[PDB]
Each structure stands twice: as structure tokens, then as C-alpha cells.
């Protein structure tokens, strides 16, 4: 069974000899190297529609809190951007650091943020996620850096829960949560083809990068900070460090929306 981790002998650096695609033409994160990222005039806008959002439960999955929404209806979609049809939203979930200096997966220009969002989304034209994982534009994962400094509001809800989800396997309910609280005021982005970033690491993603990080508060990350990786009655390991190092850019081009 799955033995994967971000601790001292199971993280990153291990995750080929069971994922050998880790090594891939396609892997994620990566450095955004932002004066060679090419502004592309032919990029849309892209479109966020979480008006009819529908969150469910959040989940200690033991290396993360995923926040669950309802994928059975096209309620919450992403479309537009480098995007071809519309993507329906599934979860999203956090990455984060011991410190405030580390804790992003992908980095811009080498500096690192203290953690970064995930918006997870599957291409519809697949009919499960399952089956969207197995394609090579199967998901796009809206990506948001987050800073340390003044608190953002739309993020209270989540760390408030967090106290009841310390552990590996718990759940809780989680319902009438609105993303879109989670989102920067610009939607400018970088965009590049690459992989989930955790074990199966499959080739399946279309990265949608925002420029804009989010602000949040220290006392917020440091909520974060306190969850745990083991399960109930285990010895204590803080879930904190949960991040993929960057990757390769190997043969790709990352592409701007804006100048
Ligand atoms: N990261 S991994 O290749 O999946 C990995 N699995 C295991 C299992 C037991 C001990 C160390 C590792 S490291
Ligand atoms: N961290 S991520 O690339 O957004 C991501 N990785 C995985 C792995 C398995 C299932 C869903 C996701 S979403
Ligand atoms: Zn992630």
C-alpha cells in the first residue's frame, strides 16, 4: 500500500522507486522563470464560475485537508485561459512550510512562498476523475501563492475546522463554503502543461499559475502548522513541509496571459 510521505525517508527525493513517472518529460512544480514565461496574445481570460459552488466535508487525507465539493452537476467550473471545454471543480487543498520562508510548490523566480492553493478541476469530456486523470488534458489545478501578512477573511472558516481534522482519516462536515473568498483580485496567470504533484504524479494537468499572491495571516498558517500527518493515539508528527520541491522544465514553455 501507499508509504509515501514528506518525512525524513519517505519524501520527494524516494517517490520514483514506486512512481517512476516522477522522473518524467512532465513533472510539476516547477521555477516560473518570469523573464523567459512568453506573453501570449492568443490566451483568454480566464473564467471562474463558483457562484453555485457546493462544499461538502474537509478531510485530513494524512498529507494534506482536502475541502470536498459536490462534482456530480456542473456547479463550480473553470473555463477559459489555455483551457479547451470546462473543467468541473472537485477539492482543493493547501501545500505549506515549517517557516513563512518555504511551503509553495511552485516557485517564481526561485523565491519560494510560505504555501500555495490547489484548485482542483476535471475535464468533463472524460466523465469521471478517474478516467480525466488517465488523459493528458484531463485536470486544470488553479494554483494561488500564498504571503504572510494581513489575514484573509475567506480563509477563517477552513482554519477554524481545523481543530476537529487534526488527524489522518478524520473528516467534518463542511458545507456553504465559498471559494471564491479564496481567490487575489487578478486573475493573470502563467500556464504550462505538467503532473499532479503528489503520488500517482500522472501527466494529466494543465497548471493555471496565478501572478497574485493571496494574503494571510500568520496566526492563519501557523492553524495550519498544528494539523498532523499520523492518525489518532500515533506519535505527533506536524503535518507542515508538505510540499514537492520544483522539477525539471525539461522540454516545455511556460506561457503569460498578460504583458
Ligand atoms: N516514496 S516511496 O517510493 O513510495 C517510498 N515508499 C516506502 C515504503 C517504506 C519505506 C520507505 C519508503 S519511500
Ligand atoms: N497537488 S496536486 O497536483 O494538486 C494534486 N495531486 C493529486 C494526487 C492524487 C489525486 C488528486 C490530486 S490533486
Ligand atoms: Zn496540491
Known sequence: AHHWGYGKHNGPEHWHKDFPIAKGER???????THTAKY???????????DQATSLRILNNGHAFNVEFDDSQDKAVLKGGPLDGTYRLIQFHFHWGSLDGQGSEHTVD??????????????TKYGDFGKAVQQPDGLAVLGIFLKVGSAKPGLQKVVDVLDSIKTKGKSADFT?????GLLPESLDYWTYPGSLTTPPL?????????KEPISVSSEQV?????????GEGEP????????????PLKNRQIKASFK
Open 40 to 50: 501570449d496574445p492568443s490566451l483568454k481570460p480566464l473564467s471562474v464560475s463558483y
Open 202 to 210: 500522472l501527466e494529466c494537468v494543465t497548471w493555471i499559475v496565478l
Open 236 to 247: 505527533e508528527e506536524l503535518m507542515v513541509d508538505n510540499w514537492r520541491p520544483a522539477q
Open 222 to 230: 501557523l492553524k495550519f502548522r498544528k494539523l498532523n500527518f499520523n
Open 27 to 33: 513533472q510539476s512544480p516547477v521555477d516560473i522563470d
Open 176 to 180: 456553504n463554503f465559498d471559494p471564491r
Open 110 to 123: 526561485k523565491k519560494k512562498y510560505a504555501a500555495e492553493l490547489h484548485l482542483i478541476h476535471w475535464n
